[PDB]
Design an enzyme around this catalytic site. Structure first.
Site, PDB file in Angstrom:
ATOM      1  N   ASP A 190      38.422   9.178 -34.598  1.00  0.00           N
ATOM      2  CA  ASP A 190      37.899   8.550 -35.810  1.00  0.00           C
ATOM      3  C   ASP A 190      38.821   8.698 -37.013  1.00  0.00           C
ATOM      4  O   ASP A 190      38.820   9.732 -37.680  1.00  0.00           O
ATOM      5  CB  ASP A 190      36.522   9.134 -36.125  1.00  0.00           C
ATOM      6  CG  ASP A 190      35.882   8.524 -37.356  1.00  0.00           C
ATOM      7  OD1 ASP A 190      34.871   9.106 -37.812  1.00  0.00           O
ATOM      8  OD2 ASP A 190      36.364   7.477 -37.860  1.00  0.00           O
TER       9      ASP A 190
ATOM     10  N   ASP B 274      40.151   1.986 -39.732  1.00  0.00           N
ATOM     11  CA  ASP B 274      39.139   2.894 -39.222  1.00  0.00           C
ATOM     12  C   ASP B 274      38.805   2.696 -37.749  1.00  0.00           C
ATOM     13  O   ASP B 274      38.055   1.795 -37.388  1.00  0.00           O
ATOM     14  CB  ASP B 274      37.877   2.787 -40.074  1.00  0.00           C
ATOM     15  CG  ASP B 274      36.784   3.728 -39.607  1.00  0.00           C
ATOM     16  OD1 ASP B 274      37.061   4.519 -38.684  1.00  0.00           O
ATOM     17  OD2 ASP B 274      35.664   3.678 -40.160  1.00  0.00           O
TER      18      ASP B 274
HETATM   19  C1  LIG Z   1      30.165   5.170 -41.051  1.00  0.00           C
HETATM   20  N1  LIG Z   1      31.022   5.985 -40.184  1.00  0.00           N
HETATM   21  C2  LIG Z   1      32.273   5.341 -39.744  1.00  0.00           C
HETATM   22  C3  LIG Z   1      33.281   6.321 -39.231  1.00  0.00           C
HETATM   23  N2  LIG Z   1      34.576   6.001 -39.183  1.00  0.00           N
HETATM   24  N3  LIG Z   1      32.936   7.573 -38.918  1.00  0.00           N
HETATM   25  C4  LIG Z   1      31.548   8.032 -38.834  1.00  0.00           C
HETATM   26  C5  LIG Z   1      31.562   9.556 -39.129  1.00  0.00           C
HETATM   27  C6  LIG Z   1      30.954   7.796 -37.435  1.00  0.00           C
HETATM   28  C7  LIG Z   1      29.867   8.581 -36.984  1.00  0.00           C
HETATM   29  C8  LIG Z   1      29.320   8.375 -35.710  1.00  0.00           C
HETATM   30  C9  LIG Z   1      29.849   7.391 -34.863  1.00  0.00           C
HETATM   31  C10 LIG Z   1      30.938   6.600 -35.296  1.00  0.00           C
HETATM   32  N4  LIG Z   1      31.537   5.572 -34.533  1.00  0.00           N
HETATM   33  C11 LIG Z   1      31.052   4.889 -33.488  1.00  0.00           C
HETATM   34  O1  LIG Z   1      29.945   5.039 -32.964  1.00  0.00           O
HETATM   35  C12 LIG Z   1      31.995   3.842 -32.978  1.00  0.00           C
HETATM   36  C13 LIG Z   1      33.332   3.872 -33.393  1.00  0.00           C
HETATM   37  C14 LIG Z   1      34.205   2.892 -32.923  1.00  0.00           C
HETATM   38  C15 LIG Z   1      33.710   1.898 -32.067  1.00  0.00           C
HETATM   39 CL1  LIG Z   1      34.772   0.665 -31.492  1.00  0.00          CL
HETATM   40  C16 LIG Z   1      32.351   1.925 -31.712  1.00  0.00           C
HETATM   41  N5  LIG Z   1      31.499   2.874 -32.158  1.00  0.00           N
HETATM   42  C17 LIG Z   1      31.482   6.811 -36.571  1.00  0.00           C
HETATM   43  C18 LIG Z   1      30.653   7.241 -39.826  1.00  0.00           C
HETATM   44  O2  LIG Z   1      29.610   7.765 -40.263  1.00  0.00           O
END
Ligand SMILES: CN1CC(N)=N[C@](C)(c2cccc(NC(=O)c3ccc(Cl)cn3)c2)C1=O
Length: 374
Positions: A35, A221
């Protein structure tokens, strides 16, 4: 170059790309969501209905307890956990072992996703957005300090029946892209913030004031599926995409991401759908480049006898998010040492016989600094 790390990413379509890591001694193996839009390393450390394995601190001789709680509320969901350190490895990564901060998640709500097959998150962004504050050093910062792994990583996320990809740590595998790498500056080290200076749909300029594109920031992201756009920009864009694809009509459950569109077999008429281009500030004064994705990126297959898709461009109140619909077209180089992000056409991106994603430049662009929101 780095054959050991090629193809070290997996995931379920629309659930996130994860890498396998081990935490503790002896090593406990976990799947960890990559992430670039967060900067905490946090792992399930207590039972949860959606977890199958989890970090057991008592079974690790190298575990050290920082004796402090961390509370992390998202738009949603949220988790809480206990800060600590331990030795951490990445099996299909560089063959090193580092001590890192770990948020051991002991309670969560709407965070863990069933079927996702990941038990934690590796936030690769910078300290400024770390919880509980920027004094909690992020994983990648610790990796680089304790090792001779250069301060750079590069992601190739593939479309492309399970998703796959590569996270190359400490360098760039030339086999993962074609053509040239083009670099845009990281405007500021918190998110991986960039500046978009022009948007086209099938060559037609969206023709907005360029700071609308970055209101209130634009970021790359890997922890987000969609290309997400500031409200104004999003409306202008779907209106443009609607006009461009007008030979076929679609329920507007579709343009909201609620409804699906379907076609027989390989009957999907990619060609009626427009390409989408973002121009990014270049490393050279008054110079930009542009990246271009296909409907094969912004139309996400949903899994018979028919092929069905969801529309993966959506609106945002927190600025532009270049999530996987963008990243899956390109090999993306997070060059932290040079404070810049690089993009090349990805050797694994999905396309058809007539069109491919593109990275092209340079383009003369004036007053690019003005496109940034303050
Ligand atoms: C808003 N946000 C965005 C981000 N970058 N990080 C987090 C911490 C987060 C928390 C939990 C899950 C996810 N991702 C997904 O579940 C995901 C990611 C990419 C794809 Cl291709 C599919 N699913 C992101 C956030 O709270």
């Amino acid at each position: 170059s780095f054959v050991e790390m090629v193809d070290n990413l997996r995931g379920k379509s629309g659930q996130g790309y994860y890498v396998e890591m081990t935490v503790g001694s002896p090593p406990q193996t976990l799947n960890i969501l990559v992430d670039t839009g967060s900067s905490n390393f946090a792992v399930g450390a207590a039972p949860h209905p959606f977890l199958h394995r989890y970090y057991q601190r008592q079974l690790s001789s190298t575990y050290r307890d920082l004796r402090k709680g961390v509370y992390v509320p998202y738009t949603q969901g949220k988790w809480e956990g206990e800060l600590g350190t331990d030795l951490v490895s990445i099996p299909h990564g560089p063959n090193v072992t580092v001590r890192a901060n770990i948020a051991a998640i002991t309670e969560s709500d709407k965070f863990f996703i069933n079927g996702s097959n990941w038990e934690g998150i590796l936030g690769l962004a910078y300290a400024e957005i770390a919880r509980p504050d920027d004094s909690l050093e992020p994983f990648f910062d610790s990796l680089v300090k304790q090792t001779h792994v250069p301060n750079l990583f590069s992601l190739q996320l593939c479309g492309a029946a399970s998703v796959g990809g590569s996270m190359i740590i400490g360098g760039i595998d030339h086999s993962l892209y074609t053509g040239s790498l083009w670099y845009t500056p990281i405007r500021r080290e918190w998110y991986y913030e960039v500046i978009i200076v022009r948007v086209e749909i099938n060559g037609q300029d969206l023709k907005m004031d360029c700071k609308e594109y970055n209101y209130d920031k634009s970021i790359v992201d890997s922890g987000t599926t969609n290309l997400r756009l500031p409200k104004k920009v999003f409306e202008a864009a779907v209106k443009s995409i609607k006009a461009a694809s007008s030979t076929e009509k679609f329920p507007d459950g579709f343009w909201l991401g609620e409804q699906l569109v379907c076609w027989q077999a390989g009957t999907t008429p990619w060609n009626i759908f427009p390409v989408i281009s973002l121009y990014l500030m270049g490393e050279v004064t008054n110079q930009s480049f542009r990246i271009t994705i296909l409907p094969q990126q912004y139309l996400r297959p949903v899994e018979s006898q028919d092929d069905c898709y969801k529309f993966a461009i959506s609106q945002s109140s927190t600025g532009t998010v270049m999530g996987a619909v963008i990243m899956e077209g390109f090999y993306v180089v997070f060059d932290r040492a040079r404070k810049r992000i690089g993009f090349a056409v990805s050797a694994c991106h999905v396309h058809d016989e007539f069109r491919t994603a593109a990275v092209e430049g340079p383009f003369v662009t004036l007053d690019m600094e003005d496109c940034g929101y303050n």
